[PDB]
């Protein structure tokens, strides 16, 4: 499950060339900005601002991607793609799922980095 | 067993819930509430009325093993049947579950045939 949560191929490359400092530094930024993001997401959902939801998804997808949190990036990919069939019916669950596991994902990442080094 | 028996399906957000909820509707059981993790679950369980727990192993905030442990400790529901349904098939995971007091274990992926037999086995053993 650590493979479905992390972008291992990307991280192993980062470690080889540069080192862990950039990941932890980047992850540090993510941990600070993330709470703000989900909150904005949650807002636009109740208010039903379609562009709102899509826009914020694009932001989290990038935020998560750069730090190697694969499942979050993927979950952001879906939220920012309103052309997908049954987006309306399933979009709310993807948001409740974003809110539910982001901290756990961050934990699994920090853990893997330590063990990795 | 009884048809009004209350179940709680603890699973974050995967295919486990749609599968299990469906197989339960087939065996006759329609009283089924769901939870996202050990935390949410424990809260819902405080409301009482539950007679059966089915749960994953990997969930944020509180995994299935901690939830199992927390349930056994709490005397108000120390005997509540808990069945683990997880991908984890290692030696450590199965022994942990046996020690903690799991009612049963089902490895993923599983088939409707198995899950129904695992349920009907526990139903006899306990006499529901």
From Swiss-Prot, chain A:
Gene for this chain: arcB
Q: Where in the cell is it found?
A: Cell inner membrane
Its function, per the record, reads: Member of the two-component regulatory system ArcB/ArcA. Sensor-regulator protein for anaerobic repression of the arc modulon. Activates ArcA via a four-step phosphorelay.
Q: What is this protein called?
A: Aerobic respiration control sensor protein ArcB
Q: Where is the HPt domain?
A: 19-112
Q: According to the record, which residues of the full protein are present here?
A: 660 to 776 of 778
Which positions carry Phosphohistidine?
Answer: 58
What about PTM? Activation requires a sequential transfer of a phosphate group from a His in the primary transmitter domain, to an Asp in the receiver domain and to a His in the secondary transmitter domain.
Curated annotation (Swiss-Prot), chain B:
Tell me a GO biological process for this protein: chemotaxis
Concerning InterPro entries, the annotation shows: CheY-like_superfamily (IPR011006), Sig_transdc_resp-reg_receiver (IPR001789), ST_Response_Regulator (IPR052048)
Gene from which the chain derives:
cheY
UniProt name for this protein: Chemotaxis protein CheY
Modified residue N6-acetyllysine is at which positions?
91, 108
Q: What does the UniProt record say this protein does?
A: Involved in the transmission of sensory signals from the chemoreceptors to the flagellar motors. In its active (phosphorylated or acetylated) form, CheY exhibits enhanced binding to a switch component, FliM, at the flagellar motor which induces a change from counterclockwise to clockwise flagellar rotation.
The terms describing its cellular component in GO are: cytoplasm
Which keywords belong to this entry? Acetylation, Chemotaxis, Cytoplasm, Flagellar rotation, Magnesium, Metal-binding, Phosphoprotein, Two-component regulatory system
Domain Response regulatory span(s) in chain numbering: 6-123
The cofactor binding remark recorded in the entry reads: Binds 1 Mg(2+) ion per subunit.
Give its localization.
Cytoplasm
Binding sites annotated in the UniProt record for Mg(2+) = 11-12, 56, 58
Q: Which organism is it from?
A: Shigella flexneri
User: PTM 4-aspartylphosphate: at which residues?
Assistant: 56
PTM info: Phosphorylated by CheA or acetylated by acetyl-CoA synthetase, depending on which acetate metabolism pathway is available.
Q: Name one GO molecular function term.
A: metal ion binding
Per its UniProt entry, which superkingdom is the organism in? Bacteria
Chief place of localization: cytoplasm
